[PDB]
Structures are given as structure tokens and as C-alpha cells.
Design a protein around this ligand. Sequence first.
Ligand SMILES: Nc1ccn([C@@H]2O[C@H](CO)[C@@H](O)[C@H]2O)c(=O)n1
Ligand SMILES: [Cl-]
Ligand SMILES: [Mg+2]
Length: 298
Amino acid sequence: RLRLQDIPALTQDHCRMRDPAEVERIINEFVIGGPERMQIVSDFDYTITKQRTEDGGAVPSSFGIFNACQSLPENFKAETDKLYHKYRPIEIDPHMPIAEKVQYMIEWWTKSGELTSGFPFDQSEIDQIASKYTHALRDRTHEFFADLQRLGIPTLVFSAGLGNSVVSVLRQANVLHPNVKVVSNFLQFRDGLLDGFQQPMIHTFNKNETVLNETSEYYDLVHTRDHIIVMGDSIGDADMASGVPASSHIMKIGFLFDHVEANMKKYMDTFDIVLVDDQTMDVPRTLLSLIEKQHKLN
Ligand SMILES: Nc1ccn([C@@H]2O[C@H](CO)[C@@H](O)[C@H]2O)c(=O)n1
Ligand SMILES: [Cl-]
Ligand SMILES: [Mg+2]
């Protein structure tokens, strides 16, 4: 019974939709269903953090947060810079198929894990770096996660980055509530020393059923959660929830900032909602608020 023209955040100029009718229908499904059937799957880097800071200030990735620590050997930032310079162009190569990218991404993550080995490391360094960027989350992220917790909605942060940094940022932002789980590449510690990352490897091209599916540990938390909101700033992010078999309705929300017109067609074909230069969580928040309205009514 909800109409799109009565939902202000969806009517704004930056909100692009290939098919507003299907979006409206999905929203109505969400609200009929209630919070108890809702689940969230969100990318971290430049989805939860800002692509454009209100200030001119730059925001580093999770890996960027790690690599900026002092406890690192003096060779580390050099070697990681070399690796990045090598594999980053490949990661964002439009012409290259994903089935060709995967090998090279495997190379990147492998070499990186092997780089981060043999020296001890303290979480508090990470924390010290991460505390400077709690102010760089999208506007109303705190309120968004507050909503999620209050509604008891399982929220997954699915990241191909460095989980320690992610968790540090989220914790220090006072946003990592009991309902929030993080699946990412986490540091592995052996006998007081680093030993790469803990299996399984999560790269940019397996943020999907190959990693998150019915066999996964997290599935038991959300096997009753058939209404999914997926949030991301990259095309790949759109398939993060492909491994949930009995999902009936999925709202795919994509945040477009870089190369707006070039990527607009792809993003519109990929996401149900495309948000252009939107550094807030006001749209997902809107959805949740409708769902909660219906919840109180019942
Ligand atoms: N060892 C690695 C592996 C990946 N990356 C970059 O971080 C992004 C995930 O947050 C990936 O998309 C990738 O660009 C990195 O900086 N260092
Ligand atoms: Cl990622
Ligand atoms: Mg991202």
C-alpha cells in the first residue's frame, strides 16, 4: 500500500531506479514481512566509510589502516606498495573477465598474507589508527546500526579487506553491536607472531556464494531471514547475498560516486537503487523506519 511518491528520500534527484515499481513492491514486501524476516549484508570500504568526506580529507581502506602502523618492519610498506601497484590495475580492469581476475587476486592476497608474517603485532596500533576515522563513516551510520540493533536485525559486514581494521573502526565508532557480525580476512597469530591471514581467503571476486552460503557458520543466524538488504559501492558487492537460497526479496543498494556517467548504466542494471554522491545512510534508514512503523502497528 506504500507508494514511492510518498517516500521523500526515494524521490530525491540522486536516487536512481531502473524500475521504481519493483522497488515499491519490494518495500511493501519488506513492511508486510516485518523486521523479524529482515537481514543486512553490507560492504565496508567506501560503503560504511565515506567516498566523499564533508571535509577534503582522505579516508584509507582497512588494509590502508593496517599498513599505516609503526610496529611494522621498515620494508613492509614498500613491499605492500609494490604489490598494490602491481595488482590494483588488474582488479579494476573492465576488459578482463572475472574468471581471469581471480587467479591474480589470489596472487595478491597470497603474497600479502605471506608479507604479513613472522613479526609480532599489537591490536592497539590498529586501534590508534582507526580512532582517527570514526568521524568518516557515512552520516547517520550510528543511527542506522542503532535501528538495526533495536529491531534485532542480523547485520553482516562482508569485506574482502582486513577484518581487524574493519572491526576496530566499527567498535570505536560504537556501532559494533551484538547483532553485527564481520566476515573478512582476519590476521592469524602463531606463537606470538603474525602468520598471514586466517582461511578462507576473501577477495573482491568471491564476496558471494563461494564464501557465504548455507554451509557457512553465519547462515544459522539468518536462515529465517528471507528479506535481504544488500549495500555496496562496487558492482561485485551486488552479489554478496547470492548464497542465501530461500531469500524471497532482495533490495540491492549501490552507492555511485566515481565515474558517475560511465558506470551509471551498469549500476542501474545491477542495483535496484543507485545513490549518486550520497554520503549518508538515510535511504536504508528510511526503509527500516517504514518496516518498524508497520511493526509497531502490529
Ligand atoms: N593485500 C591487499 C589486498 C587487497 N587490497 C585492496 O583492499 C581492498 C579490500 O578492502 C581490495 O579491493 C584491494 O584493492 C590491499 O590493499 N592489499
Ligand atoms: Cl571489499
Ligand atoms: Mg567497497
